[PDB]
Design a binder for this molecule. Structure first.
Ligand SMILES: OC[C@H]1O[C@@H](O[C@@H]2[C@@H](O)[C@H](O[C@@H]3[C@@H](O)[C@H](O[C@@H]4[C@@H](O)[C@H](O[C@@H]5[C@@H](O)[C@H](O[C@@H]6[C@@H](O)[C@H](O)O[C@H](CO)[C@H]6O)O[C@H](CO)[C@H]5O)O[C@H](CO)[C@H]4O)O[C@H](CO)[C@H]3O)O[C@H](CO)[C@H]2O)[C@H](O)[C@@H](O)[C@@H]1O
Ligand code: CL
Lengths: 1138, 214, 107
């Protein structure tokens, strides 16, 4: 019944889901190259607009309400067909004529994801009606209609076709959501008769102020292709038509939802098709409307111009995506399409570079101006042209000898196309596609994003633009604080931090525990692979700075006493930053020193800052203590903040410190140079670990655990207190590189020991642990459920052998994390929550052995306890937690009858409350709901992290020449995890188009939350790994070991790609080959008898070698996007394919 | 169509199965029907009535209020034809709120709320319990939901119950339904399914009671 | 009101249709040095010329305060500084002639 096929629709390739109406309706995003947004259900319900929800063409509501609105909002079509002497009414896509006809519903979405087609075949009449949504930068939304008569009959048809519940310009999304009825009273919908154009406006902008409020813009709709239609500008007469009656034209309707309907009569001959289109746009002023009315009346080629602008949209989309290596052609179009959409969601969320490594002087100059007024006035930019390269900027920067200019030049990232990732299925996220200027509609180079979201997206991005890696690293490091954390957002301007609300007690700020180590590390690994020795050149270079986030992490004894109350907002420090920002610009948000308006440190110091912060929270055998008033990756386990401890972060810290240790061993420097203030901190942490090394021979006692945490935590506390209170003085001291290597080696000894104490009997590893302070002298550890995140982390740690990695995965597959129906992985075990009648029952014994509770029973008091009519006892139904119970006990104590007893038995009743509800075990909402991160739900990003981790484990096994059994069994895991991701699943099992990413699939539905998930970043890296694209020692290697034979073409095909110079070009592929791009160079793999690589250059030469590793220089020609290399062909042995 | 009263009848006529769904717009002009609306002189009772002229069947439901019991929906299915019908009916109320959702959250973030829904049937009684798995709260602390909305019924012999609208469309398409007692992640509903033989010039009656804050 | 044989609070009246609310006369434009300069320089912060040669106030204006705000924005440019101070009362006066906000009693 429900199949998916590649099909040709009007000479373009689409995926067709046949009988999509047999699926529970699923939600999609239709992507544009421009600023269109469209969120649409498979049933046709939608919201759409341009830029943001404040310019909605159709109302912006949550995805459930959108799906539920298909009958009254959006596309609507009714046909009165003359058949014999009968008038027959057909209303495709509606539920108004249930089982009246045999029908087939099909749904199509194109390979680019910017067009969707809805189709209904009326089998009884042999009629098919299609409509398709397209985007046009110039014209807005375009709905292309086709009515096709494939019968042998001739029909007289009266049709009514259009769009309804059209928003007028100027209604806020909040008002439309909460007060839609009031808005109706201000609606005026009008037709311009000369043109047939519909104008949808308000009589006045709705405003609480008692002043004039003119509404001088409108939404519009118009059409082409129908002869002499009658128009409706409302849905008032819709039902009359539905009941086989004729309609009256409307040109001026007040007080009603806007609509735009065309009515015409026609004779549809057998084996013929009639076509028309409707165009709708938002945010139109008088001049915009007149230009359209003039074009309708005077421009005989208007239809052709619309079609041209639609195709330009696709073309611009391809250029954006192709520049991040979106284009692949294999035997498997599903994987090809999934790679394209993966790349698009990655660049939509993190951005894409404007034009290779090219920079415009105007934009660069404004950036410097906003950043630092004193650098801007000092540095003369005459010597740069209107356009210059990143290498030009670097050569220029080296002549200015200004470390602030060095930093700002290096941080500059000419990204465009990024937007925050809100939509009706993520309605708590406010989105805005700010990609065309309010002024002239030209491109906007800007970006903003949440810390972990954007730095994740950039890891994938960097692979297509490697020479920007330095920029990204400086951006990350320089936006990090001296106490080793970071603000929640980065922007082109700089960064933003969260503030406190009102005097609201439940409003608090902090730092996320995962934000630093793993995301930094992926960048450091990348640069050391592409440019070995480059990090070494930063070791002594004092060009890095400290982000001044005005958060005060409290003294150690206060944290230990209450680890949920650990960070205060420093309002006086905010005053100083605001003054500096008025006076310098964005650079005013950096730490000054006593001497210098901006304090500068080197790379070694920055790594120490973040590493000492982590080590200062290291609880041996437990992990990194979570005590910074924010969780890590999983927001649904946010209650672990306080007594929770992250082994996840420790596994990554192992990888990090192993990397750093290798980095230092390869250095020739004998010394390091760090802030004087850091010396005591650094030395105290190092010394603590050194003198406790001997404990690693065995397990560490609860007593020793606390001795160690106390020394580490006191040392950090002393350091931050000094800096918070007297700042950095500006003097640095020289210490030995050998000491730093010693610090790194001993830190690793402790971490390794801790990892070995964290294996479960089933061979999984602990993810998050609990700590408690016992007898003021000890720290005890307890454990939580098996969690997927812990397995991803330990498998990424670099610590285990290949056999051990395999044992972990065998355990994972055999564990309660494996979900059978989707053959993928939960975040934690599914579990039965107590049914309503089973959650709140106090044992008869506990009641009769409590004088307080017994007294409340016999006196019929129901403030705390109640007896039902079968004799069972319950806590008051208003209680959410113990605080409500305590509150209630306070209320009882202000009565004479209960006063003595409250003081006596209150701890006891609180203890009975804890026995019933077991709130000590609460980790967060994860364990108490049934979607998103909750029970029985697959959260795909984490599965895709597993996949990448397992890929890395596979490469290790191959590179170390493990047995074929071990390698094979790891591959078995790799390919199964990959299959679980679901690209080859049926639509009915996937629950949507399998080529589109979604954030999660809950137990009782298909895929939920379309588009911009971080999952896509992981699946891009995995695809590159799978293709055998490896960079080591500055050298590009193209040498697949995980790639399957069945990816190679079975027939000849044409690969249409885009060069680095925006040229749309073609290569002919033959059987036994495939193609992709890397740094936007086309790469062809062909099966051959001998290994060989052939590099074709722009000068018409080619060069061959048997080796599939390219030299440093050729590799930098690839990475550099200079256009010197036209293509690369790799000849691969059949025997090396899987 | 998706919230409140919903009624679907599968009627055996000759050897054919006929689906009738009064008060809906799901079967436009499938039948000659008359819809009548009644409100009493005191303004505290309302009756919705649909006469299916083709079958000579009338369905009425009436909303009443009870201080003790909450809302009471009194149903009457009346056969004024000369025919005898085997009827499988599915009747009830849908998009029942669980206790403890603020009107602001239901207005702006209805989708998030679904993820916390759990609808249960008490088998011995047939009573439906509509609650959350937790009160939805921005704080990082436990939040027990210790009250519920309820629905229950009298007058039908040995009914099968749904506590959701998941199977509504199968029934609409003339298929039979499976009993439900525990549905997670979905809008609450309370449906009764029974089979009966409705003789000519006879009337069957039942009621559904729903209350809040239990 | 005939159809209900009862009484309105005040007369029903035809409000200008969308394309009829915001048109500046050809004469008022060519007898304003400021507006004419903004036209020939293609500045659209205050005034715009459509493709049939009719003139309109910026579509973002709700009332004179948005106009004043926009004139402040123009005055922080050297090209328009002299002219803002000179002709601002005049441009506000043309705005009042188009919209007749002196007659506004409420919604
Ligand atoms: O539905 C519930 C059910 O779901 C199941 O999951 C199904 C899922 O697995 C399936 O996905 C297919 C995927 O598995 C497949 O992967 C294969 C891969 O296994 C294969 O690996 C080989 C190794 O097998 C081999 O190892 C050998 C070793 O075992 C032996 O002991 O020693 C040998 C040496 O002495 C050693 O060689 O080694 C070779 C390399 O040397 C590996 O290649 O490799 C092939 C390709 O080479 C790979 O294809 O891929 C398919 C597509 O390519 C996937 O379709 O999909 C089903 C859905 O259709 C899922 O149901 C779960 O497994 C069950 O537990 C659940 O109950
Ligand atoms: Cl937001």
């Amino acid at each position: 019944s429900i199949t998916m096929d590649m099909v040709s629709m009007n000479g373009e390739m689409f995926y067709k889901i046949a009988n999509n109406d047999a699926m529970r309706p699923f939600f999609m995003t239709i992507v544009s190259d421009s600023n269109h947004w469209m969120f649409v259900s498979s049933n046709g319900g939608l919201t759409a607009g341009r830029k943001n929800a404040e310019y909605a063409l159709f109302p912006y509501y949550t995805d459930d309400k959108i799906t539920e609105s298909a009958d009254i909002t959006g596309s609507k079509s009714i046909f009165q067909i003359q058949y014999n002497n009968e008038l027959i009414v057909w209303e495709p896509f509606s539920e108004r004529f249930t089982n009246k006809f045999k029908i087939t519903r099909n749904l199509y979405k194109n390979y680019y994801g910017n067009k969707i087609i809805f189709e209904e075949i009326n089998e009884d009449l042999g009629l098919t009606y299609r409509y398709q949504w397209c985007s046009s930068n110039q014209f807005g939304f375009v709905r292309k209609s086709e009515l096709s008569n494939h019968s042998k009959n001739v029909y007289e048809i009266s049709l009514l076709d259009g769009i309804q519940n059209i928003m007028p310009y100027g209604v806020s999304s909040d008002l439309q959501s909460s007060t839609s009825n009031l808005v109706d009273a201000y609606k005026r919908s009008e037709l311009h008769p000369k043109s047939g154009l519909g104008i949808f406006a308000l009589s006045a902008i709705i405003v609480d102020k008692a002043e004039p409020s003119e509404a001088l813009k409108a939404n519009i709709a118009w059409s082409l292709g129908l002869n002499n239609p009658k128009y409706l500008v409302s849905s008032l007469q819709l039902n009359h038509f539905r009941n086989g009656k004729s309609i009256s034209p409307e040109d001026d309707i007040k007080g009603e939802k806007g609509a735009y309907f065309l009515n015409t009569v026609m004779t549809l001959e057998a084996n013929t098709q009639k076509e028309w289109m409707i165009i709708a746009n938002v945010n139109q002023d008088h001049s915009d409307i007149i230009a359209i009315t003039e074009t309708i009346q005077n421009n005989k080629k208007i239809a052709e111009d619309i079609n041209t602008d639609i195709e330009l949209g696709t073309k611009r989309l391809i250029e954006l995506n192709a520049s991040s290596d979106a284009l692949q052609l294999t035997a498997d179009n599903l994987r090809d399409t999934r790679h394209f959409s993966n790349t698009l969601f990655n660049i939509m969320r993190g951005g894409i570079f404007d034009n290779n490594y090219q920079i415009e002087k105007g934009d660069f100059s404004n950036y410097i101006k906003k950043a630092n007024k004193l650098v801007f006035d000092k540095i003369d930019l005459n010597a740069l042209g209107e356009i210059f390269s990143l290498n030009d900027l670097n050569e220029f920067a080296s002549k200015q000898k200004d470390v602030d200019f060095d930093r700002l030049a290096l941080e500059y990232l000419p990204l465009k196309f990024s937007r925050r990732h809100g939509d009706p299925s993520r309605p708590w996220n406010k989105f805005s596609i700010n990609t065309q200027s309010e002024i002239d509609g030209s491109k906007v180079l800007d970006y903003e994003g949440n810390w972990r979201d954007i730095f994740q997206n950039w890891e994938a991005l960097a692979h297509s633009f490697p020479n920007f890696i330095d920029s990204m690293i400086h951006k990350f490091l320089n936006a990090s604080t001296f106490d080793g954390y970071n603000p929640y957002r980065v922007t082109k301007e700089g960064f933003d931090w969260e503030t406190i609300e009102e005097d609201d007690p439940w409003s608090y700020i902090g730092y996320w525990g995962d934000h630093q180590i793993i995301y930094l590390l992926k960048f450091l690994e990348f640069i050391e692979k592409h440019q070995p020795g480059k990090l070494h050149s930063y070791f002594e270079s004092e060009c890095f700075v400290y982000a001044a986030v005005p958060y005060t992490i409290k003294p150690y004894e206060e944290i230990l006493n209450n680890p949920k109350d650990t960070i205060g907002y420093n309002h006086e420090w905010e005053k100083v930053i605001n003054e500096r920002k008025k006076s310098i610009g964005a650079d005013g948000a950096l730490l000054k020193s006593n001497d210098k308006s901006i304090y500068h440190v080197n790379f070694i110091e920055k790594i120490l800052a973040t590493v000492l912060a982590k080590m200062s929270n290291f609880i041996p055998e437990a992990g990194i203590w979570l005590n910074t008033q924010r969780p890590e990756w999983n927001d649904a386990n946010n209650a672990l903040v306080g007594n929770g401890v992250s082994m996840v972060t420790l596994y990554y810290l192992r990888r990090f410190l192993k990397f750093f240790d290798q980095l230092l061993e390869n250095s020739t420097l004998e010394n390091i140079k760090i802030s004087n203030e850091m010396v005591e901190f650094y030395h105290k942490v190092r010394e603590t670990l050194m003198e406790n090394q001997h404990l690693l021979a065995g397990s560490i006692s609860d007593t020793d655990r606390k001795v160690i945490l106390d020394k580490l935590g006191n040392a950090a506390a002393d350091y931050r207190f000094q800096i918070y209170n007297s700042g950095f003085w500006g003097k640095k001291r020289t210490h030995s590189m050998q000491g730093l290597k010693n610090f790194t080696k001993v830190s690793l000894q402790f971490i390794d020991h801790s990892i070995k104490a964290n294996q479960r009997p089933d061979k999984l590893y602990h993810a998050y642990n609990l700590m408690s302070v016992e007898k003021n002298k000890e720290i005890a550890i307890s454990y939580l459920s098996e969690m997927l995140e812990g397995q991803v982390a330990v498998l990424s740690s670099g610590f285990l052998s290949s056999k051990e990695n395999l044992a972990v995965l065998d355990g994972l597959k055999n564990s309660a994390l494996f979900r059978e129906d989707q053959y993928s992985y939960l975040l934690y075990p599914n579990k039965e929550l107590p049914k309503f009648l089973d959650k709140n029952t106090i044992s008869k014994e506990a009641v009769s052995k409590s004088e307080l509770l017994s007294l409340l029973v016999s006196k019929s008091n129901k403030q705390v306890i109640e007896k039902d009519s079968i004799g069972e006892y319950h806590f008051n139904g208003e209680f959410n937690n113990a605080s409500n119970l305590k509150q209630a006990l306070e209320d009882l104590s202000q009565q004479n009858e209960y006063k003595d007893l409250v003081a006596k038995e209150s701890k006891t009743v609180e203890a009975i409350f804890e026995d019933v509800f077991n709130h000590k075990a609460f980790t967060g909402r994860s364990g108490t709901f049934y979607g998103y991160e909750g029970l029985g739900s697959i959260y795909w990003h984490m599965v895709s992290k597993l996949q990448l981790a397992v890929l890395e484990c596979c490469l290790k096994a191959v590179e170390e020449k493990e047995s074929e059994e071990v390698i094979g069994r790891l591959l078995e895991h790799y390919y199964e995890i990959n299959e679980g991701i679901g690209v080859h699943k049926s639509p009915s099992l996937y629950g949507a188009f399998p080529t589109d990413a979604y954030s999660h699939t809950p137990a009782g539905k298909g895929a939920q939350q379309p588009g911009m998930t971080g999952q896509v970043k992981e699946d891009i890296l995995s695809r590159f790994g799978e293709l055998g694209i490896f960079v080591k020692n500055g050298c590009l290697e193209l040498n697949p070991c995980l790639l399957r034979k069945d990816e190679f073409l079975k027939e000849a095909k044409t690969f249409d790609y885009v060069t680095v110079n925006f040229q749309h070009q073609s290569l002919e592929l033959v059987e036994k080959s495939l193609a992709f791009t890397y740094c936007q160079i086309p790469i062809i793999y062909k099966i051959a008898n001998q290994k060989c690589i052939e590099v074709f250059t722009n000068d018409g030469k080619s060069a061959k070698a048997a080796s599939l590793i390219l030299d440093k220089q050729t590799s930098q020609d690839v990475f550099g996007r200079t256009g010197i290399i036209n293509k690369i062909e790799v000849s691969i042995l059949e025997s090396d394919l899987r």
